[PDB]
Amino acid sequence: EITPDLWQEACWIVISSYFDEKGLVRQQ
Amino acid sequence: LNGLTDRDLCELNECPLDPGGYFIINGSEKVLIAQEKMATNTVYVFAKKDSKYAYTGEC
Amino acid sequence: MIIPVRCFTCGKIVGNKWEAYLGLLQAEYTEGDALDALGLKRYCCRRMLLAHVDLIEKLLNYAPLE
Amino acid sequence: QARAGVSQVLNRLTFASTLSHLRRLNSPIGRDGKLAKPRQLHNTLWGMVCPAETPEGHA
Amino acid sequence: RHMCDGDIVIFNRQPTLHKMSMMGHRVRILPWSTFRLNLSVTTPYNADFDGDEMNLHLPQSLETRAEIQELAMVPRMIVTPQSNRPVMGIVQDTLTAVRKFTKRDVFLERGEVMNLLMFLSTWDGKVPQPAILKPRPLWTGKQIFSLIIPGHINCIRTHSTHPDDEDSGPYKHISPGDTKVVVENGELIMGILCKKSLGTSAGSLVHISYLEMGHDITRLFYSNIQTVINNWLLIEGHTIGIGDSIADSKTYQDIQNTIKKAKQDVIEVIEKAHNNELEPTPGNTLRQTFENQVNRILNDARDKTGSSAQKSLSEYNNFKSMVVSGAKGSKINISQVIAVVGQQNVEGKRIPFGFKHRTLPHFIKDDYGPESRGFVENSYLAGLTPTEFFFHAMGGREGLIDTAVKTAETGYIQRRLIKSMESVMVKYDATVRNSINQVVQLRYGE
Amino acid sequence: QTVRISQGPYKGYIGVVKDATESTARVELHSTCQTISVDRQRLTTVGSRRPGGM
Amino acid sequence: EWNIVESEKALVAESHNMKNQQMDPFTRRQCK
Amino acid sequence: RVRGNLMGKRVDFSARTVITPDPNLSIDQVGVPRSIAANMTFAEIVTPF
Amino acid sequence: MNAPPAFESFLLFEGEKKITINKDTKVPNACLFTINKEDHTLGNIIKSQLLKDPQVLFAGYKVPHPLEHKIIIRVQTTPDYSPQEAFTNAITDLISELSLLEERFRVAIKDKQEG
Amino acid sequence: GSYVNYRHLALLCDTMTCRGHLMAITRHGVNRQDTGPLMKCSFEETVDVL
Amino acid sequence: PYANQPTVRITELTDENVKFIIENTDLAVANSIRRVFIAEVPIIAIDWVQIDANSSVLHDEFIAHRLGLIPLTSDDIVDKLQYSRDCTCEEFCPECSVEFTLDVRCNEDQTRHVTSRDLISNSPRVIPVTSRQDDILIVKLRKGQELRLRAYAKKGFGKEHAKWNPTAGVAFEYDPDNALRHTVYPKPEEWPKSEYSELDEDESQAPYDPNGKPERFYYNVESCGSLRPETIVLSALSGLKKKLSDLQTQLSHEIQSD
Amino acid sequence: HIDQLKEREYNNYSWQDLVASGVVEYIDTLEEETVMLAMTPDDLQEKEVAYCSTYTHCEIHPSMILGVCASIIPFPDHNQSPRNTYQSAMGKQAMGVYITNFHVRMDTLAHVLYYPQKPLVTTRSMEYLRFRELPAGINSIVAIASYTGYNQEDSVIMNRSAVDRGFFRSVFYRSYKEQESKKGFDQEEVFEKPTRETCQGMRHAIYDKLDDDGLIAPGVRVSGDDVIIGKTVTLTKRDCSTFLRTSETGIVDQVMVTLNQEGYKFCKIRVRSVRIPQIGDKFASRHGQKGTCGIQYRQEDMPFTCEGITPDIIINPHAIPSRMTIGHLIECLQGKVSANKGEIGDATPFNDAVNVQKISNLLSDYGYHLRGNEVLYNGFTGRKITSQIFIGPTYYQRLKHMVDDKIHSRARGPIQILNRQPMEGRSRDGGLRFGEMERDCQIAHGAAQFLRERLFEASDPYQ
Amino acid sequence: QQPMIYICGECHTENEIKSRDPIRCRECGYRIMYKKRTKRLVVFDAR
Ligand SMILES: [Mg+2]
Ligand SMILES: [Zn+2]
Ligand SMILES: [Zn+2]
Ligand SMILES: [Zn+2]
């Protein structure tokens, strides 16, 4: 189901997952 | 330190917070700056005016 | 690295409250309630318990012997 | 005859500096060029390169 | 012997652009380890007290010490020959403090007056008659400032907020807004002091003081002005905050209405251009005239918003006080903070199409609207949209690059200019020649 | 040698005499990063030996 | 965990109080 | 040589320190520290006066 | 490295006087009292106390430089009342007022505890 | 909006129009003047002029 | 041409702070008394630390810094001791100082919390605030480390260093209603009422008063734990009186010498 | 997806799952030109004037455009771009705990701060940059005003009592490297105390300060021009040993001795130095407001609010309008709100729910002016200040540009070998350069005697 | 009679190392070792 309005919190869970899986210097 | 728990890192006089990815030459942290250049195998058609050519198809 | 002994601005002793602050936060209390439960009225002394970072723990992880 | 500054000493003055240095770029254009097109922030640098973090000297 | 108090040195800053960059100073040792100097002497050196560096040479001969004391000195180097106007002027918080100190509605008690007189190196030792004897002795800011003015100086200047339609009509010699500075016998009578009368400008009060009175008198004048105004600032106090940046909730309505009108107008212009009605303006093509009309519309909207914002401030506002005093700021800054930032031009034009016929991936192709080409509709108080944030960053980068190239080119220009007329001088025959004794001008400056 | 200021405003500090003269003597303060010039009579040798050595 | 639940309750409360939003210091672009 | 050591040389009795405001000093004064003052010297001729 | 110590703000140095009187020449009956190793604490109360006295035509202090521990007090009284006795009376009555204030505060405290 | 005294402008103009021809302020206009070898090397072209 | 008759009234007396009011006095006296409350208040504190073995993770000077900020109760000892500078002996004599000792070494597996309670003082009454509420945490030791040292305490005042600053924060305030117009509110309705404001909730500020002097100075001296609040006030008054007496004596000598 | 992701860590759910599921997608710069990107999912799609209605993608969060140093800036969009760039460049120069295992490292020029508190207002982006764990500043009660005048042209006034209590008090290390080697058949280095008899070449400094092994022991007082290692090379011996640089005045932390790849005795020594914050030290906030401490006043002299809260730093009001750094003011206001409430606030660049009016309304609910201004008192006389000063907590940094590392002087120091002119560099004890521009300025002043003195008398006399 | 005692790197075990000797621990055998605190009067002022 779509996530109306309540999206500021779900906006950063994806960012947290990305930074947890790949580090800041992952490219090197 | 490939996939090593923070316990060992702390025991090896290192911290789990160090980003890593830097060489150690003569006990000095060396880092390679990412150089940028023109993409290869792509055709570029510039229009240099300070020359005898109206257009130049560099590749 | 370690909780200071006194508030930079005011001067009230705050060193003897870090453990109490952690205990109150652990039991049920929140931050906004724990701060005034400990006796911190002025907002200048409240940063010492909110802004302070406890880095002495990471330092203790590098035990010299054993 | 080769390039210079490709491998730099990692500035370990603060964690933010270490993070910044490990993810830094450098263009091969000559230092202090009369032109002003490569230095200007181009529109295509959206979400790829920080539009604010950059030196303020000759580079 | 070691350097002791009273010795003459030559304090200098590393980039020496002009003559007023190496003046002698008297020594005064202080406990802490940091060079210090009066704020007024900061303008010539172009220093900023933000981690700068300033050299300090020391002669080793009575001959050279006397030569520097007589030729290269701060009080002697007040007026420059490049523009025959003072270089050291009040351009810091003292300026705003003194402006508020000389308003008509400034009253001081005996305690404050006697406390301020202590910071006066030229006080004759007699208390002036208070401007208001009964019901309580109250002095006025202008009356105290008169004692700071040395000698019998006479000059006339106009204040920053002086309405032009005032001299023509009545109330010429009695201004309701307390403007039209008038000094007679070295006593302030009317007007409010600002940069126009105390700053670095031709005919300023300090300029008149230097021309009439001696250089040391002007030095004492500067010292007394700073030492009294800064001390009174304690009782007055100056600040800045959010309370000085908020509008009256109606100004926001006016600004929003104006912005909407501008958007509608630019959309109408775009529609006309699309349907082929906007005829080409003389001397320009269709695209050129379209861009010119859009830019004029946006600039008019920005000016209207700024004027509406300015007219909606209160006398207690701090931005307005610092702008009218001229110490630091301008009206455009207030306009950008409250009303609207404006257009983020680059290379003298709007934001180009870096991608294929569009500025950023968000906006659609062929979107020449204001917000899609750099027009920042919001203001620094209400945040910025990401797209306009990026465009604003582009403008700042343009400015930084311009500054870097100027800093590299002007040095060479100045070097070439100095190496071509380094031997020219005025001989005792009252004539200008060069090293080869070739007359260049029978009289200096004709 | 290590000395100790027994009189004067700096009473209690510990330092090592850097340059000595017939009347005055410079002593670098251990705590503070500054060297002062205190009178010789104000100093009192404390020394730092190591009894035993077996 | 308490911060996560605090954020979730703040979001649901913000969604609930959707009566009126008339504020001066905020705006957003509206092209075309 | 010319631009390196004839038109621009290195002189002694120099200093370079950060600067800070100090309104209590006159425009012609300068607040030097104590270390730099004690390090530099001024050759003065002796005279019975 | 050149930071002054902390005792040079209140402790007198050998040879420095705690107070020096210097008569002024611009107007009659006017002397400048220079105090060493003091701050606004010991000059503002004296300034106010002198202001209370009607025979004092002028009274006010200053700090020649914040880093320097020194304050100059300028006093000017009527010709039939020298400024020295004015300074003495200001100090005397100020001391009396402080002692009385201390006594009242002490009795108020002793009454507050269980009373 | 800046202002510069006319005396300086006039002095520069005369120095550039003293020898009849428009001497360039560059190394190609000042070194041609018969000033002296020690003065030409200061600006530019040190070894060439020497 | 004389002084005035100030009055005092205590509104709240506790063992942590006092709220008194001073009426019928000049503003200069009130501000001076405040600055004395903060700066010139004799009190004992750590000022000479001899570290013999510090195997902790912190710096060698960090321990001394933290020890310098630990308050020490001096209800009846500060008035007896003399300044070490004016002492007439060598070494920190107990007649003019108080000795301390700290010898802790983490032997067990769990980490130690070296608190102020470890400062074993030779004197009974000169002890850190642990009589009658955790103790001031100095440092944390782990199995294998140790911290042995002994320090001495001396008398000093805040003007020398912040360690001798007994008062935590003095709440000085006078004329709650902006009656003397010493501050001009651009929008009085937007400001809250002071704690001591007698004005009703309708009016924003009291009307102007031309012939009106500042009186009724409110105080909220808050003791850090070393000296009792009322004791701080009494010491400050006595010290200010002593400074005036010394100044008067010096002035009399100067006048007599001339 | 959000539910399955919020329960990560516990089970095994990660970013790879989102990528494989077909929800996210990596678009490179060359392909980004052919997609209708959208900023936020809700706002830019509901139903309004038909703009495009053909969005293909949507960004995660707008503030993610910022880099590393720019992300820590609170409210970057509320400030002009040059000041954001200045902050981004100055952030790298902030001191603090640069790495947890600093006591083991022996790097050169390491700075560490005693009490690196955490910002009272943290952006949602620094949570992954790891800034909160290793901060580089302290939250100070900053009051923007012009108290005395020592903070007028980009300068501040710090509290002497605060510094005494350990406000921004950091430390300075300085490591060394030196090892023996076989120079030649007859030449050879060895660690040994150079006595006053056998060693010919020798310095006029103290040598018994170190032990017999030739390495100064830890926790020993040292000063400028003092021997730190007892190296002596045989020709009888030459004192080829190093000395502490002039104007360092530190204490030895630890001494490490080992063998290098060649197998010779290799040793490293680091000397710490407690740098008490003094005037001239460069500070800066998170908005580009650089500056140097002009003067330091004690608590009794600083102003104070209705209660005992004296400002810790006082910047110039005039630095705000010209530079347009309203983000700094917003940060101060939100910090006051956070301190009163008791929890860190949000300063995300683009949030659509953090304006000034709502923050002000929150602040009005604690007995404080909605705009943050408060009434102070003149710390000297005790009279209320007419203007209501703006005081509140704010996060400030400290740069390494100490005044002691830059102060320099000279009086006939060492001379070069090629051209007999003074040396160059503070470390080599050299003199300043009297540049050609200074010569032109002096010619303009017409002071020929002073010019000839600077160029001949005090530069390189010779006959 | 001071043989210049040292502390091992990882063992943290005291070792007696004299001149003209290899730098290694009495056990295991490493190449890193630090010195012990001086015996001087390390006296600070809690300022
Ligand atoms: Mg600058
Ligand atoms: Zn506080
Ligand atoms: Zn004794
Ligand atoms: Zn081994």
Query: Which DSSP string corresponds to G7-32?
Result: HHHHHHHHHH--S----SS-------
* Chain G CA closest to residue A13: G4
In Å, how far from its chain's centre is CA K72? 11
CATH topology of domain K43-162: RNA Polymerase Alpha Subunit; Chain A, domain 2 (2.170.120)
Check the annotation: does C35 bind a ligand.
no
**DSSP string covering chain K, please?**
------EEEEEEE-SSBEEEEEES--HHHHHHHHHHHHSS--EEEEEEEEEEEE-SSS-HHHHHHHHHT--B--TTTTTTS--GGG-SSSS--GGG-EEEEEEEE--SSSPEEEEGGG-EESSSS--BS-------EEEEE-TT-EEEEEEEEEEE-TTT-GGG--BS----EE-SS--S-SS--SSGGGSPPPTT--S-SS-SSPPP-SS-----EE---BB-SSS-HHHHHHHHHHHHHHHHHHHHHHHHHHHHH-
Subunits close to F (at least 3 CB pairs below 8 A): I, K, L, M
- Among residues D9, D11, D14, K58, the alpha carbon closest in space to that of L95 is found at D14
The answer, for B9 touching chain L at a CB cutoff of 8 Å, is no
Structure-block tokens of residue L362: 């929150």
Identify which ligand lies nearest to the alpha carbon of K88.
3
Within a 10 A sphere around the Cβ of E316, how many other Cβ atoms?
15
Q: C-alpha angle L408/L409/L414, rounded to 5°? A: 110
In Å, how far from its chain's centre is CA E24? 26
CB L389 within 8 A of CB L431: no
Phi, psi of K241 (to 5 degrees): -60, -40
Query: What is the distance between the alpha carbons of residues C35 and C43, in angstroms, rounded to a whole number?
Result: 10
Structure-block tokens of residue K189: 């309705």
Q: Where are the domains of chain K?
A: 1-42+163-258, 43-162
Q: Which of F14, F53, F54 is the closest to M43 by Cβ?
A: F14
SS3 labels along E49-85: CCCCCEEEECCCCHHHHHHHHHHCECHHHCEECCCCE
Pairing of strands E425-427, F14-20: unpaired
Q: Helix, strand or coil for residue J29?
A: helix
**Which residues, 6+ apart, have CB-to-CB distance to E249 below 8 Å?**
G24
| Burial status of residue E365 (CB atoms within 10 A of its CB: 0-12, 13-18, 19 or more) | exposed
Residues of L identified as active-site: 154
Which residues does a gap of C–N over 2.5 Å follow in chain A?
none
Measured in Å, residue C9 CA sits from the centre of ligand 2 at 5
Measured in Å, residue C37 CA sits from the centre of ligand 2 at 15
Q: C-alpha angle E143/E147/E152, rounded to 5°? A: 110
Q: Do H24 and I66 touch (CB under 8 A)?
A: yes
Size of interface I-K (CB pairs under 8 A): 124
| Burial status of residue L159 (CB atoms within 10 A of its CB: 0-12, 13-18, 19 or more) | buried
| Residue K69 bridge partners (DSSP) | none
Q: Cα distance from E319 to chain I (closest Cα, Å)? A: 30
- Chain K positions touching L361 (Cβ under 8 A) are none
DSSP 8-state secondary structure symbol assigned to residue E177: T
Q: Which residue shows structure tokens 């509320």?
A: L78
Query: What is the distance between the alpha carbons of residues J16 and F37, in angstroms, rounded to a whole number?
Result: 63
Angle between helices K229-257 and I41-52 (to 10 degrees): 70
Residue L169, CB-side half-sphere exposure with 13 Å CA sphere: 22
Q: Which residue shows structure tokens 């000169």?
A: K126
Query: What is the distance between the alpha carbons of residues K33 and I73, in angstroms, rounded to a whole number?
Result: 20
Query: What is the distance between the alpha carbons of residues L90 and L82, in angstroms, rounded to a whole number?
Result: 12
Query: What is the distance between the alpha carbons of residues L55 and L41, in angstroms, rounded to a whole number?
Result: 10
The answer, for C42 touching chain B at a CB cutoff of 8 Å, is no
All domains in chain I, ordered by first residue: 1-115 (3.30.1360.10)
DSSP 8-state secondary structure symbol assigned to residue L432: P
Instruction: Judge H/E contact: 3 or more CB pairs < 8 A.
Output: yes
Identify which ligand lies nearest to the alpha carbon of E51.
1
Q: Which residue shows structure tokens 């530069």?
A: L459
From first CA to last CA, the distance across chain G in angstroms is 44
Residue set of the binding site of E for Mg(2+): 48, 50, 52
Helix (H) / strand (E) element for A10: namely helix A8-21
Q: Indicate the CATH number of E92-236 among 3.40.50.300, 3.40.640.10, 1.10.274.100, 1.20.1600.10.
A: 1.10.274.100
| Residue L138 bridge partners (DSSP) | L396
Structure-block tokens of residue C63: 């035990």
Residue type, E257: N
Query: What is the distance between the alpha carbons of residues I28 and I80, in angstroms, rounded to a whole number?
Result: 11
Q: Helix, strand or coil for residue L84?
A: helix
Polymer length of chain M:
47
Within a 10 A sphere around the Cβ of L444, how many other Cβ atoms?
18
CB E213 within 8 A of CB E186: no
Check the annotation: does K224 bind a ligand.
no
Chain L residues 123-162 with CB within 8 Å of chain C: 132-135, 138-141, 159, 161-162
Q: Do K186 and E136 touch (CB under 8 A)?
A: no
Q: Helix, strand or coil for residue L326?
A: helix
Phi, psi of J17 (to 5 degrees): -135, 40
All domains in chain C, ordered by first residue: 1-66 (1.10.10.60)
CB E90 within 8 A of CB H23: no
Q: Do L407 and H17 touch (CB under 8 A)?
A: yes
Helices (H) and strands (E) in chain F, counts: 0, 5
Polymer length of chain D:
59
Q: How was this structure determined?
A: cryo-EM
CATH of the domain at M31: 2.20.28.30
Phi, psi of E293 (to 5 degrees): -65, -45
Q: C-alpha angle I20/I24/I29, rounded to 5°? A: 100
CB L112 within 8 A of CB L96: yes
Q: Cα distance from K244 to chain M (closest Cα, Å)? A: 29
Query: What is the distance between the alpha carbons of residues E41 and E43, in angstroms, rounded to a whole number?
Result: 6
Q: Cα torsion for L376, L377, L383, L386, to the nearest 10°? A: -20
Query: What is the distance between the alpha carbons of residues H32 and H25, in angstroms, rounded to a whole number?
Result: 12
**Peptide bond before I66: cis, by omega within 30 degrees of 0?**
no
CB C42 within 8 A of CB C11: no
Helix (H) / strand (E) element for E181: namely strand E181-184
The answer, for L418 touching chain C at a CB cutoff of 8 Å, is no
Within a 10 A sphere around the Cβ of I23, how many other Cβ atoms?
11
SS3 labels along C19-63: HHHHHHHHHCCCHHHHHHHHCCCCHHHHHHHHCCCCCHHHHHHCC
Query: What is the distance between the alpha carbons of residues L182 and L233, in angstroms, rounded to a whole number?
Result: 10
Q: Do E135 and K210 touch (CB under 8 A)?
A: yes
Give chain M's radius of gyration (CA, Å): 14
Measured in Å, residue M7 CA sits from the centre of ligand 4 at 10
DSSP 8-state secondary structure symbol assigned to residue B1: -
Which is it for the CA torsion L432, L435, L440, L443, positive or negative?
positive
**Which residues, 6+ apart, have CB-to-CB distance to L339 below 8 Å?**
C43, C44, C46, C47, C50, L120, L393
Q: Which residue shows structure tokens 């063998």?
A: L259
Q: Which domain holds residue M13?
A: 4-47
Q: Indicate the CATH number of K1-42+163-258 among 3.50.50.60, 1.20.120.420, 3.30.830.10, 3.30.1360.10.
A: 3.30.1360.10
- Chain D positions touching L89 (Cβ under 8 A) are 53-56
Query: What is the distance between the alpha carbons of residues L426 and K56, in angstroms, rounded to a whole number?
Result: 36
Q: C-alpha angle C17/C23/C27, rounded to 5°? A: 145
Q: Helix, strand or coil for residue L156?
A: strand
Query: What is the distance between the alpha carbons of residues I35 and I73, in angstroms, rounded to a whole number?
Result: 8
Subunits close to M (at least 3 CB pairs below 8 A): F, K, L
Within a 10 A sphere around the Cβ of L186, how many other Cβ atoms?
7
Helix (H) / strand (E) element for I112: namely helix I83-112
* Chain D CA closest to residue B25: D9
Structure-block tokens of residue I94: 């100020």
Helix extents (H) in E237-317: 251-274, 286-311
Angle between helices C43-50 and L326-341 (to 10 degrees): 90
- Chain M positions touching F43 (Cβ under 8 A) are none
- Chain I positions touching K84 (Cβ under 8 A) are none
Give chain L's radius of gyration (CA, Å): 30
**Which residues, 6+ apart, have CB-to-CB distance to L172 below 8 Å?**
L110, L111, L250, L272, L273, L275, L402
Q: Do E28 and H25 touch (CB under 8 A)?
A: yes
Query: What is the distance between the alpha carbons of residues C65 and K24, in angstroms, rounded to a whole number?
Result: 67
Which is it for the CA torsion D3, D9, D10, D12, positive or negative?
negative
| Residue L313 bridge partners (DSSP) | L142
SS3 labels along K168-225: CCCCCEECCCCCCCCCCCCCHHHCCCCCCCCCCCCCCCCCCCCCCCCCCEECCCEECC
- Chain H positions touching L434 (Cβ under 8 A) are 8-11, 14
Query: What is the distance between the alpha carbons of residues K10 and K229, in angstroms, rounded to a whole number?
Result: 12
| Residue I72 bridge partners (DSSP) | I34, I62
The answer, for K4 touching chain M at a CB cutoff of 8 Å, is no
Query: What is the distance between the alpha carbons of residues E368 and E348, in angstroms, rounded to a whole number?
Result: 17
Measured in Å, residue L46 CA sits from the centre of ligand 4 at 72
Measured in Å, residue M35 CA sits from the centre of ligand 4 at 15
Q: Which of F12, F31, F44 is the closest to K84 by Cβ?
A: F12
Query: What is the distance between the alpha carbons of residues K220 and K203, in angstroms, rounded to a whole number?
Result: 26
CB L154 within 8 A of CB K151: no
Check the annotation: does C7 bind a ligand.
yes
- CA distances E157 to E153, E196, I102, L58, Å, are 13, 7, 57, 60
Q: Which of D6, D10, D18 is the closest to B35 by Cβ?
A: D6
* Chain F CA closest to residue M46: F31
DSSP 8-state secondary structure symbol assigned to residue E419: T
* Chain K CA closest to residue E108: K182
Q: Do F16 and L273 touch (CB under 8 A)?
A: no
In Å, how far from its chain's centre is CA E31? 33
Q: Which residue shows structure tokens 């949209």?
A: E385
Residue set of the binding site of E: 48, 50, 52
Subunits close to K (at least 3 CB pairs below 8 A): C, E, F, I, L, M
Q: How many domains does chain M have?
A: 1
Q: C-alpha angle D28/D31/D36, rounded to 5°? A: 90
From first CA to last CA, the distance across chain C in angstroms is 23
- Among residues L401, L372, L403, the alpha carbon closest in space to that of L388 is found at L372
Q: Do E445 and J7 touch (CB under 8 A)?
A: yes
- Among residues E350, E318, E346, E348, the alpha carbon closest in space to that of E334 is found at E318
Helix extents (H) in L109-213: 126-129, 160-164
Helix extents (H) in E312-385: 318-325, 331-334
Residue C11, CB-side half-sphere exposure with 13 Å CA sphere: 33
Query: What is the distance between the alpha carbons of residues E353 and K197, in angstroms, rounded to a whole number?
Result: 63
Residue C64, CB-side half-sphere exposure with 13 Å CA sphere: 18
Check the annotation: does C44 bind a ligand.
yes
Residue type, L193: K
Q: Cα torsion for L410, L414, L420, L422, to the nearest 10°? A: -30
Query: What is the distance between the alpha carbons of residues K190 and K204, in angstroms, rounded to a whole number?
Result: 9
Q: Cα distance from B5 to chain A (closest Cα, Å)? A: 15
- Chain L positions touching D52 (Cβ under 8 A) are 66-67, 70, 73, 76, 81, 84-85, 88
**Which residues, 6+ apart, have CB-to-CB distance to L463 below 8 Å?**
none
Phi, psi of E415 (to 5 degrees): -60, -45
Q: Do H35 and I66 touch (CB under 8 A)?
A: no
Which is it for the CA torsion E107, E109, E113, E115, positive or negative?
negative
CB L7 within 8 A of CB L13: yes
Query: What is the distance between the alpha carbons of residues L171 and K93, in angstroms, rounded to a whole number?
Result: 33
Q: Cα torsion for L436, L442, L448, L449, to the nearest 10°? A: -100
Q: Do H16 and L459 touch (CB under 8 A)?
A: no
Give chain E's radius of gyration (CA, Å): 28
